[PDB]
Structure 1
Amino acid sequence: VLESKSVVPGGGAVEAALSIYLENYATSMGSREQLAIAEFARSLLVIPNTLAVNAAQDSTDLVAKLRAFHNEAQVNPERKNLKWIGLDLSNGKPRDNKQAGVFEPTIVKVKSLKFATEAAITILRIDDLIKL
């Protein structure tokens, strides 16, 4: 909070929006890469899941319900009905900000985003491993 007053509302409310936000960004891309966005949005969805899983919660009935919080896609307490906001851990469900509402420092995710995207593709790089 103190070294970064820049932080995103929600840590987990992003995922549902993001997929949709990507699903939106997907559909216009067309070709294969409409889907290359979609499967990129499918990588997103574990974030509520392992949470709900480690919390012994049902992941779908949250992240789906999450994806049903919207008019357009944003994380914000003003519209939790018409937009996403926040998250919970033990129940797992979205909160607002001062509710339980989760945040993220905007620094960390983009880096985590950046890394997995890049490690996977170099993992996606090679087809061989040879030895003698």
Structure 2
Amino acid sequence: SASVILRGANDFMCDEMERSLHDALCVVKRVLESKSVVPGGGAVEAALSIYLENYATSMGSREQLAIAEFARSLPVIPNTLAVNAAQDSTDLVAKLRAFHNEALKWIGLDLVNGKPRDNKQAGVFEPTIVKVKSLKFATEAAITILRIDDLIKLH
């Protein structure tokens, strides 16, 4: 347990600083949970994008386009990050790919600055377990909705 005494000239200050004290309270944790980790910013998704893009070309059959699209539904993460960070998605997104296959994996999007930066060197690391669950859940989420041909909710 603990007891972080948070002061504040105004309750309105103690409320946002308490919500901020919880932000880096869960970041410092994910960084030490599990040895396996990955450089955020979009690097990860970027890698899988190109790699899976090649995987589709090696599989063939309907699974070629099925995997291709998948590799196109991954770079959406860094694409949005740039959009919500006041950066031109298309630019960074594309620039990320080139800088993702030149300076290796450790190349993601640093919304703070707004340019493909070495998240590994920067310190941006997230427990791989998060990535796994993210994909797993999201994936299973689709299969189900695609498995729906008709329903019956009724008032």
Query: TM-score interval w.r.t. the shorter chain?
Result: 0.7 to 0.9
Q: Which runs of 4+ in 1 moved over 4 A?
A: 70-73
Please list every run of 5 or more consecutive structure 2 residues that lacks an aligned counterpart in the other structure: 1-30
| Cα shift at 1:7 | 0.7
Inter-partner Cα distance in structure 2 for 1:104 and 1:18: 16
| Cα shift at 1:62 | 0.9
| Cα shift at 1:60 | 1.2
CA contact (8 A) 1:51 1:92 kept: no
The 3-state SS of whatever aligns with 2:72 is helix
Tell me which of 86, 93, 102 is aligned to 1:63.
93
CA contact (8 A) 1:52 1:90 kept: no
| Cα shift at 1:93 | 2.8
CA contact (8 A) 1:12 1:102 kept: no
| Cα shift at 1:90 | 3.1
> C-alpha root-mean-square deviation of aligned residues, in Å?
2.4
TM-score of the aligned structures, taking structure 1 as reference length: 0.79
Inter-partner Cα distance in structure 2 for 1:56 and 1:97: 19
1:93 aligns with 2:123: no
Higher helix residue share:
2
| Cα shift at 1:100 | 3.2
Inter-partner Cα distance in structure 2 for 1:131 and 1:113: 29
| Cα shift at 1:115 | 0.4
TM-score of the aligned structures, taking structure 2 as reference length: 0.69
Flag the 1:21–1:88 CA change in 2: closer, same or farther, 3 A.
same
Aligned-residue identity in percent:
98
Inter-partner Cα distance in structure 2 for 1:98 and 1:20: 20
Inter-partner Cα distance in structure 2 for 1:62 and 1:14: 15
CA contact (8 A) 2:107 2:119 kept: yes
Flag the 1:128–1:85 CA change in 2: closer, same or farther, 3 A.
same
Please list every run of 5 or more consecutive structure 1 residues that lacks an aligned counterpart in the other structure: 74-81
Higher gyration radius (CA): 2
Moved more, 5-14 or 31-40: 5-14
Inter-partner Cα distance in structure 1 for 2:93 and 2:111: 13
Deviations 1:80-122 (A, max 9, x none): xx65524302344322146435322111011010001001110
| Cα shift at 1:131 | 5.2
